[PDB]
Design a protein around this ligand. Structure first.
Ligand SMILES: C#C[C@H](NCCc1cocn1)c1nn(C)c2ccccc12
Ligand SMILES: [Zn+2]
Length: 139
């Protein structure tokens, strides 16, 4: 579980969005596993605006923050889960690291701010949904 809170926006994994998020929907992309909903209070997370490939992610299944190298956002074939069939997930970055379903929403951060959230995993890899291209989160 987990979310990014920036301005009057809440960024969550689409497969973990609640009743309240869908009713106050701003934007959603199934292929990215992202959903943004409006909020009444202002958030304090800063979104990174960079092309960093090193950062630190939070892994709740280990209660630990791990430093990782990650690939640039791409279109990657992801195996079927209970939430989506087997498909090409877009704007996805991979790192060698531990992750379990319940780790989705864990933040990946660089020196410039929030890079993305845990969205996929398996075979000793963790996948993060990039949010650095969503420039409208800043305004
Ligand atoms: C099921 C599930 C989770 N993905 C749901 C979202 C999704 C499905 O396809 C593309 N995205 C998952 N996230 N992590 C970090 C895992 C690690 C190991 C095994 C599964 C997972
Ligand atoms: Zn950065």
């Amino acid at each position: 579980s987990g979310a990014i809170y920036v301005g009057n926006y809440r960024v969550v994994n689409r497969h973990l969005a609640t009743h309240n998020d869908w009713a106050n929907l701003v934007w959603e992309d199934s292929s990215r596993d992202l959903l943004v909903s409006s909020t009444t209070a202002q958030g304090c997370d800063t979104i990174a605006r960079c092309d960093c490939q090193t950062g630190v992610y939070y892994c709740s299944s280990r209660r630990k923050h791990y430093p990782v190298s990650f690939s640039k956002p791409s279109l990657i074939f992801v195996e079927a889960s209970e939430y989506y069939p087997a498909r090409y997930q877009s704007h996805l970055m991979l790192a060698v690291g531990h992750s379990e379903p319940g780790d989705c929403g864990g933040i990946l951060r660089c020196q410039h701010g929030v890079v993305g959230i845990v969205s996929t995993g398996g075979n000793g890899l963790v996948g993060f949904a990039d949010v650095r291209d969503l420039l409208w989160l800043d305004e």
